[PDB]
Amino acid sequence: MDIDPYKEFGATVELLSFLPSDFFPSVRDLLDTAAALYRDALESPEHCSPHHTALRQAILCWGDLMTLATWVGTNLEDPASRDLVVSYVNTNVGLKFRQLLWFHISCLTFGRETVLEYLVSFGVWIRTPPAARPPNAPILST
Amino acid sequence: MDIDPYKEFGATVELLSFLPSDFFPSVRDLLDTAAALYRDALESPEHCSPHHTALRQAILCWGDLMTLATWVGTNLEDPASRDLVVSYVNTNVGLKFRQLLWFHISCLTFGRETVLEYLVSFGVWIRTPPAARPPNAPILST
Ligand SMILES: [Cl-]
Ligand SMILES: [Cl-]
Ligand SMILES: [Cl-]
């Protein structure tokens, strides 16, 4: 089987991958922000929206991923398990889940429709040769 | 925060934990049932249910778990192997993923409410002496 966590929301993995990695904030900064704003909504008994329903599972899934990454990097007596877990987290799943947190939090702050257009706008800007774009890349607001 | 993934769906971690860990099918079977019933709906871009939105996310991050497992057995010496990491996973979050997959799939097949009422009745039924219960077990259907 094969699923795109973004398809049901009107985006894809490729649309987010077209953003540069350094653009997304850290896993901890996103987690902090997700609490401060939607602490109350996330811990509620009402699916506030499919964005809330996705954000709860994603956040909990990542903690499962992080428990495993901890066990593998600490309790394997092979020393290369450190570098393998650091690589796995940076290279692979940390950035994949940094995008996912950012998408659903921004859809909740600026609305799904606003956020999507910002992707496509960012998409032309990056694809555009530098002397032909504005020095500042696009920016998200209401 | 502290997010119960069952709370927006009327249940709690303790209610799923109220059934014996023997009871929930392997993660592999549940994926097969999930792909055999809601493949096209889960891959659909249509939000089909808050259960759908949540099932999609659980499916993908079981894969992120097994992907890490693979790295360890591939990139490290064979005493630390994929079989070791996976044995760790299934000991840990393995049941947690079986309960989730079951709850959300079985909530799609039968009514959600059917499932919740089953959880309590089946849970007490297996705990009751044969002499002091009805002979026929609480069951799920429509
Ligand atoms: Cl971080
Ligand atoms: Cl392109
Ligand atoms: Cl008991």
Residue numbers in the entry:
A (entry chain B), B (entry chain A): 1 to 142
Task: Quote the paper.
The HBV core protein (also known as HBcAg or Cp) is an essential component and regulator of the HBV life cycle. The full length core protein Cp183 or its N-terminal domain Cp149 predominantly assembles into a T = 4 icosahedral capsid. Due to its critical roles in capsid assembly, pregenomic RNA packaging, cccDNA maintenance and suppression of innate immunity, the HBV core protein has been recognized as an attractive antiviral target. To identify the specific interaction modes between core protein and HAP_R01 or SBA_R01, we crystallized the Cp149 mutant Y132A, which remains as dimer in high salt solution and destabilizes Cp149 capsid.
Cp149_Y132A crystallizes in three forms: (A) open triangle, formed by trimer of dimers, (B) closed triangle, mimicking the three CD dimers around the threefold axes of HBV capsid, and (C) spike-contact packing (discovered in this work). However, a new space group was discovered during our crystallization screening of Y132A mutant. The packing in the new crystal lattice, termed spike-contact packing, generates three types of interfaces. The novel apo structure suggests that at high local concentration, core protein dimer has a tendency to associate with each other in different formats, not limited to triangle format. Interestingly, during our photoaffinity study, we identified Y88 in the spike region as an additional label site for both R- and S-configuration HAPs. As core protein modulators may trap capsid in different states, the spike-contact format or upside-down format of core protein packing may represent one state of the total ensembles.
